[PDB]
Design an enzyme around this catalytic site. Structure first.
Site, PDB file in Angstrom:
ATOM      1  N   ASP A  60     -21.545  47.185 -45.895  1.00 35.46           N
ATOM      2  CA  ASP A  60     -20.400  46.579 -46.562  1.00 35.46           C
ATOM      3  C   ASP A  60     -20.157  47.306 -47.878  1.00 35.46           C
ATOM      4  O   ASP A  60     -20.956  48.162 -48.270  1.00 35.46           O
ATOM      5  CB  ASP A  60     -20.788  45.093 -46.837  1.00 35.46           C
ATOM      6  CG  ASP A  60     -19.626  44.264 -47.356  1.00 35.46           C
ATOM      7  OD1 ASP A  60     -18.466  44.594 -47.003  1.00 35.46           O
ATOM      8  OD2 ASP A  60     -19.884  43.291 -48.133  1.00 35.46           O
TER       9      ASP A  60
ATOM     10  N   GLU B 220     -16.285  51.276 -49.772  1.00 31.89           N
ATOM     11  CA  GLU B 220     -15.054  52.003 -50.069  1.00 31.89           C
ATOM     12  C   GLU B 220     -15.208  53.291 -50.898  1.00 31.89           C
ATOM     13  O   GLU B 220     -14.472  54.225 -50.601  1.00 31.89           O
ATOM     14  CB  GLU B 220     -13.985  51.088 -50.644  1.00 31.89           C
ATOM     15  CG  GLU B 220     -13.509  50.000 -49.669  1.00 31.89           C
ATOM     16  CD  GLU B 220     -14.570  48.952 -49.369  1.00 31.89           C
ATOM     17  OE1 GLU B 220     -15.372  48.610 -50.296  1.00 31.89           O
ATOM     18  OE2 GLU B 220     -14.633  48.486 -48.187  1.00 31.89           O
TER      19      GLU B 220
ATOM     20  N   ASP C  35     -12.258  40.559 -45.606  1.00 32.55           N
ATOM     21  CA  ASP C  35     -12.144  39.241 -46.226  1.00 32.55           C
ATOM     22  C   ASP C  35     -10.813  38.655 -45.896  1.00 32.55           C
ATOM     23  O   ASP C  35      -9.852  38.748 -46.705  1.00 32.55           O
ATOM     24  CB  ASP C  35     -12.330  39.367 -47.766  1.00 32.55           C
ATOM     25  CG  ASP C  35     -13.721  39.835 -48.124  1.00 32.55           C
ATOM     26  OD1 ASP C  35     -13.947  40.369 -49.222  1.00 32.55           O
ATOM     27  OD2 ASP C  35     -14.631  39.686 -47.297  1.00 32.55           O
TER      28      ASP C  35
HETATM   29  C1  LIG Z   1     -16.852  37.961 -51.560  1.00 26.48           C
HETATM   30  C2  LIG Z   1     -15.841  39.032 -51.911  1.00 26.48           C
HETATM   31  O1  LIG Z   1     -15.766  39.038 -53.361  1.00 26.48           O
HETATM   32  C3  LIG Z   1     -14.889  40.009 -53.931  1.00 26.48           C
HETATM   33  O2  LIG Z   1     -13.535  39.811 -53.535  1.00 26.48           O
HETATM   34  C4  LIG Z   1     -12.919  38.588 -53.959  1.00 26.48           C
HETATM   35  C5  LIG Z   1     -12.369  38.710 -55.375  1.00 26.48           C
HETATM   36  O3  LIG Z   1     -13.459  38.801 -56.290  1.00 26.48           O
HETATM   37  C6  LIG Z   1     -11.697  37.392 -55.734  1.00 26.48           C
HETATM   38  O4  LIG Z   1     -11.185  37.474 -57.070  1.00 26.48           O
HETATM   39  C7  LIG Z   1     -10.548  37.146 -54.796  1.00 26.48           C
HETATM   40  O5  LIG Z   1      -9.629  38.181 -55.121  1.00 26.48           O
HETATM   41  C8  LIG Z   1      -8.334  37.944 -54.547  1.00 26.48           C
HETATM   42  C9  LIG Z   1      -7.405  37.149 -55.458  1.00 26.48           C
HETATM   43  O6  LIG Z   1      -7.823  35.779 -55.429  1.00 26.48           O
HETATM   44  C10 LIG Z   1      -5.950  37.206 -54.969  1.00 26.48           C
HETATM   45  O7  LIG Z   1      -5.119  36.607 -55.977  1.00 26.48           O
HETATM   46  C11 LIG Z   1      -5.472  38.623 -54.640  1.00 26.48           C
HETATM   47  O8  LIG Z   1      -5.362  39.459 -55.808  1.00 26.48           O
HETATM   48  O9  LIG Z   1      -6.421  39.232 -53.760  1.00 26.48           O
HETATM   49  C12 LIG Z   1      -7.755  39.319 -54.290  1.00 26.48           C
HETATM   50  C13 LIG Z   1      -8.671  39.958 -53.270  1.00 26.48           C
HETATM   51  O10 LIG Z   1      -8.412  41.340 -53.261  1.00 26.48           O
HETATM   52  O11 LIG Z   1     -11.002  37.225 -53.422  1.00 26.48           O
HETATM   53  C14 LIG Z   1     -11.725  38.409 -53.045  1.00 26.48           C
HETATM   54  C15 LIG Z   1     -12.184  38.270 -51.593  1.00 26.48           C
HETATM   55  O12 LIG Z   1     -12.950  37.057 -51.467  1.00 26.48           O
HETATM   56  C16 LIG Z   1     -15.299  41.374 -53.403  1.00 26.48           C
HETATM   57  O13 LIG Z   1     -14.369  42.349 -53.907  1.00 26.48           O
HETATM   58  C17 LIG Z   1     -15.322  41.410 -51.867  1.00 26.48           C
HETATM   59  O14 LIG Z   1     -15.780  42.725 -51.570  1.00 26.48           O
HETATM   60  C18 LIG Z   1     -16.320  40.381 -51.373  1.00 26.48           C
HETATM   61  N1  LIG Z   1     -16.478  40.368 -49.900  1.00 26.48           N
HETATM   62  C19 LIG Z   1     -17.644  41.083 -49.311  1.00 26.48           C
HETATM   63  C20 LIG Z   1     -18.949  40.486 -49.819  1.00 26.48           C
HETATM   64  C21 LIG Z   1     -19.801  39.777 -49.043  1.00 26.48           C
HETATM   65  C22 LIG Z   1     -21.046  39.212 -49.653  1.00 26.48           C
HETATM   66  O15 LIG Z   1     -22.092  40.154 -49.354  1.00 26.48           O
HETATM   67  C23 LIG Z   1     -19.612  39.566 -47.580  1.00 26.48           C
HETATM   68  O16 LIG Z   1     -19.973  38.217 -47.223  1.00 26.48           O
HETATM   69  C24 LIG Z   1     -18.149  39.784 -47.213  1.00 26.48           C
HETATM   70  O17 LIG Z   1     -18.124  39.747 -45.773  1.00 26.48           O
HETATM   71  C25 LIG Z   1     -17.726  41.147 -47.766  1.00 26.48           C
HETATM   72  O18 LIG Z   1     -16.463  41.551 -47.211  1.00 26.48           O
END
Ligand SMILES: C[C@H]1O[C@H](O[C@H]2[C@H](O)[C@@H](O)[C@@H](O[C@H]3[C@H](O)[C@@H](O)[C@@H](O)O[C@@H]3CO)O[C@@H]2CO)[C@H](O)[C@@H](O)[C@@H]1N[C@H]1C=C(CO)[C@@H](O)[C@H](O)[C@H]1O
Ligand SMILES: *[C@@H]1O[C@H](CO)[C@@H](O[C@@H]2O[C@H](CO)[C@@H](O)[C@H](O)[C@H]2NC(C)=O)[C@H](O[C@@H]2O[C@@H](C)[C@@H](O)[C@@H](O)[C@@H]2O)[C@H]1NC(C)=O
Ligand SMILES: *[C@@H]1O[C@H](CO)[C@@H](O[C@@H]2O[C@H](CO)[C@@H](O)[C@H](O)[C@H]2NC(C)=O)[C@H](O)[C@H]1NC(C)=O
Ligand SMILES: *[C@@H]1O[C@H](CO)[C@@H](O)[C@H](O)[C@H]1NC(C)=O
Length: 826
Positions: A412, A415, A511
């Site tokens: 994961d 990028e 996500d």
């Molecule tokens: C868990 C997830 O965290 C990070 O992404 C999150 C952002 O930190 C949040 O602020 C939120 O951003 C979104 C804004 O709410 C929205 O207004 C719009 O601008 O889009 C934004 C998202 O681009 O939500 C994001 C996603 O939840 C981090 O960047 C992301 O990489 C993380 N996801 C991975 C991490 C884990 C934990 O190991 C895995 O469980 C997931 O499968 C991964 O894909």
């Protein structure tokens, strides 16, 4: 100043005394300061790679420029008023170079004269010119707006599979959640498929720009224009003419989809937030108590010591307990997959960091290791272009696997994701490029939340050029680590990807959110990754971000039980969503996972087909029905293989769905007495009560199924039931590929595999069902038995010597022994 003035042909020649290629020298008409230094002289070649693939390569005549290394993506080397024409007698594609000022070129079909790619400029309009500057390449083709239907150019979330007119698609790998429509996401796939409705309906070709730099692609319906910020133009056109042939041609170039082990088609469970080993054991136990099949248990970053790769939390996931947990999974025919991130924490007492430093494996900037921020805090990133970093990665995986057995790896944040954005290097046009691509939908600087463009990789390669390859390279290294530590066929899931990633890894849509929109978005994305040569694709069932609802989760397991990769996963700040938590969800899961498991031999055969010819497992309706233009715009139904169609409910409160059916007779796989018959393809309002999803098989197809079971290993030991769907107009056929489910080389020369083909045709008074077998010895040694055949699609009953259903039971036939069965009508 104008953006650019374009080029003139200085000379051009078709090479005689060879399977022709064309070589030309182009010279810049006039310089422009806009977007930086123009390249003065271009070498332009057009050449046939195969009869069905044309390659157009445009480089600086006087200097080498960045190209994706052959070692990363192996492929044939480049070739050694007035027009110059290139054609081959065994190729449908005709290339023409037009010596206008500025110059142009077209590719058209010898057979239909349809122009496929038309880069002839409109002399007054520089937006239509080829412009070639150090950090701005512009290449444009006109398109017949109503007749050209385009698909691809990932990775983006969209409500439609066919690309809508009037949009900009940006390719720049970024940690941006897939619940966001339109924005550039984790992967970059600069390929599109173009299906023409006229002159000859269903005529399809593909277009690929083999370039790893950031780009914007603007599609206005009557034109498509690439705006690329480095590299060269190395453009491949694939002749088709069917959509299947296009993907066979494309994957011949970028790599065939990796084979997958049989167990990877089982159901997977993950959650960010599982607190300790006791919790993951409880989840496994509750799936079993609910009688819902669960094949693989996954652990997210919770299992690590303070979010550090290659460690275990000694309080919550202590090694002795984790070893007992994995041993129990394996005793029960289940598997275990942990996550790994690329960033290595910089703590001086952490063994992984100490070894990485000793081998000098990390990406540098300004001569020093580049310091990012990710889950454990400060990190350095391994340089996966550096052979020493690949060796390091193999060794870390070996060390960890030696202590805690694993069955596969989830990679994961590759990028690569960075939680900080570094300041640009003063004066650098790499950190401050003259043309800003539409990163994050707001012309956001390319260094945002990633590794800066001025960071350096092995071979003096800049992150500017190699950014989009990072995830792809980590996948290559990770698959190599798995192969070096187990003789089984490996399993890998990766977030960031590039064209060619499918040769190494599965992908999921990232996500997403627990929203009804995202339930539907999963379909175009699944279809797109098939076109990208990554058929092992799925979305997080019930939605990753935000809390799901009982109804959304019920409809989502109904759809998601048919994704090639089927996994429930969720974010930590949301309600839990294991399938056993609500009775209506559990009841639906048992029904749909039941059918998926009966279809395991079929999914596995489709995986074998994808590895052989690039044909996706989940495919658009127009792959089977390319002469039916009504299918081109379908985005909410899909096929599994040739003849099975899934038509999900995608709206809250619905107990029916208006679904398109192509011509003919279709039979429900959940109740063979329920059928749909249409002449001209049309919409049918299918009943879809809360506990049901519609899945139908079309006449002309034969599918071999096995029994339900709680694990795929147990499923493989059940009898085969053959489903034969007859057609009035054509013989029915199907195929079954069998091996031990885990061989390194699928269908290789060792011959530890069998391929069965099935045939059925009706006479005036009889019916014959038969099989033909390649390598009978192997399936015989595995004892596989076909005990039943069900025959659909006839209006009279058959026996051994409205529609009705005939069942021939108690057969006890070995699948390895070719048979011919004659049936008579009653
Ligand atoms: C868990 C997830 O965290 C990070 O992404 C999150 C952002 O930190 C949040 O602020 C939120 O951003 C979104 C804004 O709410 C929205 O207004 C719009 O601008 O889009 C934004 C998202 O681009 O939500 C994001 C996603 O939840 C981090 O960047 C992301 O990489 C993380 N996801 C991975 C991490 C884990 C934990 O190991 C895995 O469980 C997931 O499968 C991964 O894909
Ligand atoms: C590098 O790893 C060390 C080993 O885990 C960290 O020191 C340890 O931090 C523990 C958890 O925060 C703490 O209970 C231990 O007593 C301590 N152990 C040792 C051997 O010192 C270290 O943590 C930092 O430094 C210590 C002295 C404390 O101030 C912690 O609060 C710090 O976070 C790690 N270094 C870094 C930069 O994290
Ligand atoms: C099943 O029926 C078909 C006809 O629908 C049979 O084929 C015919 O066989 C006769 C001899 O019995 C020939 O003279 C005809 O020319 C055949 N017709 C065709 C279209 O080839 C077929 O043999 C039958 N199968 C069995 C084993 O009974
Ligand atoms: C299956 O379909 C038929 C036709 O609608 C119906 O009568 C029957 O009750 C259905 N239920 C079963 C047995 O699955």
């Amino acid at each position: 100043e104008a953006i650019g003035y374009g080029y003139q042909v200085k000379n051009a020649k078709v090479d005689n005394s060879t399977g022709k290629s064309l070589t030309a020298l182009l010279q810049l008409i006039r310089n422009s300061p806009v977007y930086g230094p123009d390249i003065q002289f271009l070498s332009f070649t057009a050449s046939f790679e195969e009869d069905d693939t044309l390659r157009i390569r445009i480089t600086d005549a006087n200097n080498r420029r960045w190209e994706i290394p052959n070692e990363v993506l192996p492929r044939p080397p480049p070739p050694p008023p007035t027009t110059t024409v290139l054609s081959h007698p065994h190729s449908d594609l005709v290339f023409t170079l037009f010596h206008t000022t500025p110059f142009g070129f077209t590719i058209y079909r010898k057979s239909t004269h349809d122009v496929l790619f038309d880069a002839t400029p409109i002399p007054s309009n520089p937006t239509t010119f080829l412009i070639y500057k150090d950090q701005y390449l512009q290449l444009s083709s006109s398109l017949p707006a109503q007749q050209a239907h385009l698909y691809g150019l990932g990775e983006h979330t969209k409500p439609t599979f066919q690309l809508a007119h009037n949009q900009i698609l940006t390719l720049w790998n970024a940690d941006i959640a897939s619940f966001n429509r339109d924005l550039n996401l984790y992967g970059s796939h600069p390929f599109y498929m173009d299906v023409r409705s006229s002159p000859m309906v269903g005529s399809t070709h593909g277009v690929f720009l083999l370039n790893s730099n950031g780009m914007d692609v603007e599609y206005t319906g009557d034109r498509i224009t690439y705006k690329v910020i480095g590299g060269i133009i190395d453009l491949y056109i694939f002749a088709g003419r069917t959509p299947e042939m296009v993907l066979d041609q494309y994957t011949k170039l970028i790599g065939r989809p990796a084979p997958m082990p049989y167990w990877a088609f089982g159901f997977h469970q993950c959650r960010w937030g599982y607190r300790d080993v006791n919790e993951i054991e409880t989840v496994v136990d509750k799936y079993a108590e609910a009688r819902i099949p669960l094949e693989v248990m996954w652990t997210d970053i919770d299992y690590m010591d303070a979010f550090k790769d290659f460690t275990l939390d000694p309080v919550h996931f202590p090694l002795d307990k984790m070893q007992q947990f994995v041993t129990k999974l394996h005793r029960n025919g289940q598997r275990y997959v942990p996550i790994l991130d690329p960033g290595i924490n910089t703590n001086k007492s952490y063994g992984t960091f100490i070894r990485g430093m000793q081998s000098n494996v990390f990406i540098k900037r300004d001569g020093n290791p580049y310091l990012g921020s990710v889950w454990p805090g400060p990190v350095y990133y391994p340089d996966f272009l550096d052979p020493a970093a690949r060796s390091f990665w193999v060794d870390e995986i070996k060390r960890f696997r030696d202590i805690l057995p694993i069955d596969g790896i989830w990679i994961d944040m590759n990028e690569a994701s960075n939680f900080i954005t570094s300041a640009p290097t003063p004066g650098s046009t790499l950190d401050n490029p003259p043309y800003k691509i539409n990163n994050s939908g707001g012309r956001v600087p390319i260094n945002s939340k990633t590794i800066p463009a001025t960071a350096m990789h092995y071979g003096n390669v800049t992150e500017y050029n190699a950014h989009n390859l990072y995830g792809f390279l980590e996948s290559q290294a990770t698959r190599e680590a798995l192969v070096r530590t187990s003789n089984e066929r490996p399993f890998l899931l990766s977030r960031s990807t590039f064209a060619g990633s499918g040769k190494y890894t599965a992908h999921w849509t990232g996500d997403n959110a627990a929203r009804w929109d995202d339930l539907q978005y999963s379909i175009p994305t699944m279809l797109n990754f098939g076109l990208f040569g990554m058929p092992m694709i799925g979305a997080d069932i019930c939605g990753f971000a935000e809390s799901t609802t009982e109804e959304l989760c019920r409809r989502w397991i109904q759809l998601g039980a048919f994704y090639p990769f089927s996994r429930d996963h969720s974010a930590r700040d949301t309600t839990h969503q294991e399938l056993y938590l609500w009775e209506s969800v559990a009841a639906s899961a048992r029904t749909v996972l039941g059918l998926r498991y009966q279809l395991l031999p079929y999914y596995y055969t489709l995986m074998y087909d994808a590895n052989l010819r690039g044909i996706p497992i989940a495919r658009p309706l127009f792959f089977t029905f390319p002469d039916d233009v009504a299918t081109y715009g379908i985005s909410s139904q899909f096929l599994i293989g040739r003849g099975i169609m899934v038509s999900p409910v995608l709206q809250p409160g619905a107990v029916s769905v208006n679904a398109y059916f192509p011509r003919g007779n279709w039979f429900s796989l959940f109740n063979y007495t329920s059928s749909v018959s249409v002449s001209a393809g049309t919409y049918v309002s299918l009943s879809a009560p809360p506990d049901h999803i519609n899945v139908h098989i079309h006449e002309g197809n034969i599918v071999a199924m096995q029994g339900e079971a709680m694990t795929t290993q147990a499923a493989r030991s059940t009898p085969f039931h053959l489903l034969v769907v007859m057609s009035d107009h054509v013989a029915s056929t199907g195929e079954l590929f069998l091996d031990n489910g885990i061989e390194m080389d699928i269908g290789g020369p060792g011959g530890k595999w069998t391929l069965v083909r099935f045939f059925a045709e009706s006479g005036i008074n009889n019916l014959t069902i038969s099989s033909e077998v390649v390598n009978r010895g192997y399936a015989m040694s595995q004892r596989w038995v076909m005990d039943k055949i069900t025959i659909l699609g006839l209006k009279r009953r058959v026996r051994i010597k409205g529609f009705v259903v005939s069942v021939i039971s108690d057969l006890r036939q070995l699948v390895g022994q070719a048979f011919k069965l004659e049936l008579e009508f009653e």
